[PDB]
Amino acid sequence: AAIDECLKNAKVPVTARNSTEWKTDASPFNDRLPYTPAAIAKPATVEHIQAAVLCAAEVGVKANPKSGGHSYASFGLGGEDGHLVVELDRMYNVTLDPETHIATVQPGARLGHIATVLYEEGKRAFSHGTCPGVGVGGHSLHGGFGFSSHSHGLAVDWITSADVVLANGSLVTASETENPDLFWALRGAGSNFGIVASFRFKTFAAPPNVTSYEINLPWTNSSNVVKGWGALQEWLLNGGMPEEMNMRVLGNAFQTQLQGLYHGNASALKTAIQPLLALLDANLSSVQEHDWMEGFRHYAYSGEIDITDPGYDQSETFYSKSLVTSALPPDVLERVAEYWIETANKVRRSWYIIIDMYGGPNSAVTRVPPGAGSYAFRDPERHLFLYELYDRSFGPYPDDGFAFLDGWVHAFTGGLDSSDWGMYINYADPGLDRAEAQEVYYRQNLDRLRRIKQQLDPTELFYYPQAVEPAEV
Ligand SMILES: *Cc1cc2c(nc3c(=O)[nH]c(=O)nc-3n2C[C@H](O)[C@H](O)[C@H](O)COP(=O)(O)OP(=O)(O)OC[C@H]2O[C@@H](n3cnc4c(N)ncnc43)[C@H](O)[C@@H]2O)c(*)c1C
Ligand SMILES: *[C@@H]1O[C@H](CO)[C@@H](O[C@@H]2O[C@H](CO)[C@@H](O)[C@H](O)[C@H]2NC(C)=O)[C@H](O)[C@H]1NC(C)=O
Ligand SMILES: *[C@@H]1O[C@H](CO)[C@@H](O[C@@H]2O[C@H](CO)[C@@H](O)[C@H](O)[C@H]2NC(C)=O)[C@H](O)[C@H]1NC(C)=O
Ligand SMILES: *[C@@H]1O[C@H](CO)[C@@H](O)[C@H](O)[C@H]1NC(C)=O
Ligand SMILES: *[C@@H]1O[C@H](CO)[C@@H](O)[C@H](O)[C@H]1NC(C)=O
Ligand SMILES: *[C@@H]1O[C@H](CO)[C@@H](O)[C@H](O)[C@H]1NC(C)=O
Ligand SMILES: O[C@@H]1[C@@H](O)[C@@H](O)OC[C@H]1O
Ligand SMILES: O[C@@H]1[C@@H](O)[C@H](O)OC[C@H]1O
Ligand SMILES: O[C@@H]1[C@@H](O)[C@H](O)OC[C@H]1O
Ligand SMILES: O[C@@H]1[C@@H](O)[C@H](O)OC[C@H]1O
């Protein structure tokens, strides 16, 4: 087709439709949501990225970058058939400056590779998600929360600059002192404004020791959930969680527990966690001290950590939702708990809920000023919890299945004003229509995002079904 011929004349490497690598390059993380690209550009340099983008523009097809391919909605494939996919997985180099400790990171680098390089070379790190296979591209541009986030913020917070290919093939570098509107827009909604061709990340010195731990919670009836969660949110909201502690509730039908990573040794953790244990009347378990990389492997849930192989093909079949909420009124706790016990526990599929200890007075995430970036959820009291709701089938996902997580989210949102909840596009939920998605993902920052979108991508070359709409002018 015309896109193929354009790329060929432009000397852009591609994955041919009839090649073995098509299947690999085109394959979603979420097997529920395969899409067939118009074509797959396989850039080795920013020049190839520029050329691919221009080809899409000239030919008249949409284009999207695919970094790690982990979009829960397969938005790196375009979220529908027929886009040019700019597959970035051949560009995964990580360079660490020994002086400045600034890492130059190619946009197809996955988190496990980045973490390995930074640690092996200079015992450095930045704050990012768990999951070695996740691409830095989608992850860092929309937030990126992990077991260092209470201590050190989101992945997006470690970006110091980015080189970007715009919709018309122009190159720009975005930073606090250059293209500051774009730098703002990138840092929360970056899928909408161009293809980031290179990141620079600041780093922190990796702590010599981190301690993972668990606290099993007796959340087996509604009253226990309500009282437990009620205590937990009050503790968090009142500054109970120290900066070194990073923690979440993981719940499934068969067990509920807090899971933490404490940036310090086991004796320091025990002392730090005691007030919570007394409050919940609970016990610590599985206390394990680690070096930095072993801490990362602990929550990685993956054999391979330093992943760079283009054959990468981990996939699951699932539906997922997210939320960001304030503290929950007890009426909402009750509805959410009743849903958990009476509905979620009975669902005959592998589901889980994660409630991240996200905000509160000690969180690095919510110490970032409200004007710093387009990422919306920075208020230490209003943005207290981040949630992942995940509903996985082994075999085809049932078409009536969505009502399960949909109903659960309704139990929260029925009792919260729209100023007290949002959603998180790193757990992209294609159940939301375009209008709702923009609103819930970006909330108070949507209007400025729409203005920058009209300025940088007025033709919506980088369209996907939950992309920011250009402001009308
Ligand atoms: C599969 C998976 C996802 C996880 C895991 N753990 C996470 C965690 O511990 N914390 C989190 O906050 N998130 C976690 N996630 C979710 C991932 O954070 C999101 O799914 C990321 O958005 C995925 O990033 P990536 O793998 O790069 O996904 P893509 O599908 O390639 O892209 C998503 C989105 O971003 C755009 N995009 C990619 N690359 C670029 C560049 N270079 N420039 C602009 N825009 C880019 C894509 O077009 C698409 O829109 C654990 C697991 C197992
Ligand atoms: C990432 O880094 C490696 C080197 O660390 C680059 O490898 C070079 O590749 C070129 C051809 O592409 C060869 O001529 C050199 O011999 C390679 N050097 C080494 C030391 O192996 C690689 O090009 C870089 N990849 C990207 C995508 O930028
Ligand atoms: C490519 O797009 C960029 C961004 O939309 C254009 O650069 C802008 O040009 C306008 C009009 O001159 C200026 O007001 C903006 O300040 C520019 N923005 C930036 C970030 O530089 C650029 O003109 C476009 N190039 C072409 C050939 O159309
Ligand atoms: C602490 O970290 C060091 C490396 O920094 C590691 O070698 C050691 O085993 C760790 N200690 C424990 C108890 O895990
Ligand atoms: C819930 O379970 C606890 C035991 O964990 C029990 O004491 C309590 O009475 C139960 N509450 C209800 C309402 O069933
Ligand atoms: C644990 O860390 C503290 C610092 O918070 C330090 O004083 C103490 O020596 C450490 N304990 C061990 C066994 O390394
Ligand atoms: O509610 C129950 C759930 O919690 C789990 O134990 O599996 C059986 C279900 O009936
Ligand atoms: O463990 C992972 C969790 O950290 C992330 O939030 O969502 C995906 C899970 O696999
Ligand atoms: O460098 C910053 C760090 O000091 C803070 O803790 O988290 C946000 C980062 O941008
Ligand atoms: O029906 C919707 C489905 O098409 C989408 O993939 O996931 C959300 C569902 O509500």
For 149, how many CA atoms within 13 A lie in the half-sphere containing its CB? 26
Distance CA 318, CA 183 (A): 33
Q: 69 is in which domain, residue-wise?
A: 1-208+438-473
Distance CA 279, CA 52 (A): 57
159 and 219 assigned to the same domain = no
264 and 361 assigned to the same domain = yes
For 452, how many CA atoms within 13 A lie in the half-sphere containing its CB? 25
Centre of ligand 7 from the C-alpha of residue 124, in Å? 43
- Angle at CA of residue 433, ends 390 and 359, nearest 5°: 50
**Contact residues for 326 (Cβ-Cβ < 8 A; gap 6+):** 381, 382, 383, 384, 385, 416, 420, 421
Tokens of 240: 């109970």
248 is an annotated ligand-binding site residue? yes
282 and 386 assigned to the same domain = yes
Centre of ligand 3 from the C-alpha of residue 154, in Å? 30
Best residue for ligand 10 mutational test, from 31, 32, 402 (most atoms within 8 Å of Cβ): 402
Method: X-ray
133 and 216 assigned to the same domain = no
4 and 46 assigned to the same domain = yes
404 and 318 assigned to the same domain = yes
Kindly compute the dihedral angle of the four CA atoms of residues 454, 458, 463, 468, in this order, to the nearest 10 degrees: 10
187 and 231 assigned to the same domain = no
Distance CA 217, CA 282 (A): 7
Distance CA 274, CA 280 (A): 10
Residue 207 Cβ contacting ligand 1 at under 6 Å: no
263 and 162 assigned to the same domain = no
- What is the domain-level CATH number for residue 81? 3.30.465.10
**What is the residue with the minimal CA distance to atom 26 of ligand 2?**
91
CB atoms closer than 10 angstroms to residue 469:
16
41 and 176 assigned to the same domain = yes
Beta strands in 89-158 (DSSP E): 94-96, 103-105, 124-125
Nearest to residue 218, comparing CAs of 208, 206, 231? 231
Tokens of 210: 């981190």
427 is an annotated ligand-binding site residue? yes
Q: Which residue has the tokens 């990362």?
A: 296
Domain count, the chain: 2
How many Å from the N-terminal Cα to the C-terminal Cα in the chain? 34
127 and 34 assigned to the same domain = yes
Tokens of 143: 């937030």
**Ligand that comes closest to the CA of residue 223:** 5
293 and 429 assigned to the same domain = yes
Residue 388 Cβ contacting ligand 8 at under 6 Å: yes
Q: Where would I find the H helices in 83-221?
A: 111-122, 136-141, 149-152, 180-189
- Contact yes or no for 102/151 (Cβ under 8 A): no
- Contact yes or no for 272/242 (Cβ under 8 A): yes
Beta strands in 408-452 (DSSP E): 421-422
Residue 431 Cβ contacting ligand 10 at under 6 Å: yes
Ligand 5 cavity residues, CB under 6 Å: 218, 221, 223-224
**Contact residues for 325 (Cβ-Cβ < 8 A; gap 6+):** 383, 384, 385, 387, 412, 416, 420, 421
412 and 463 assigned to the same domain = no
Tokens of 70: 């982990």
- What is the domain-level CATH number for residue 278? 3.40.462.20
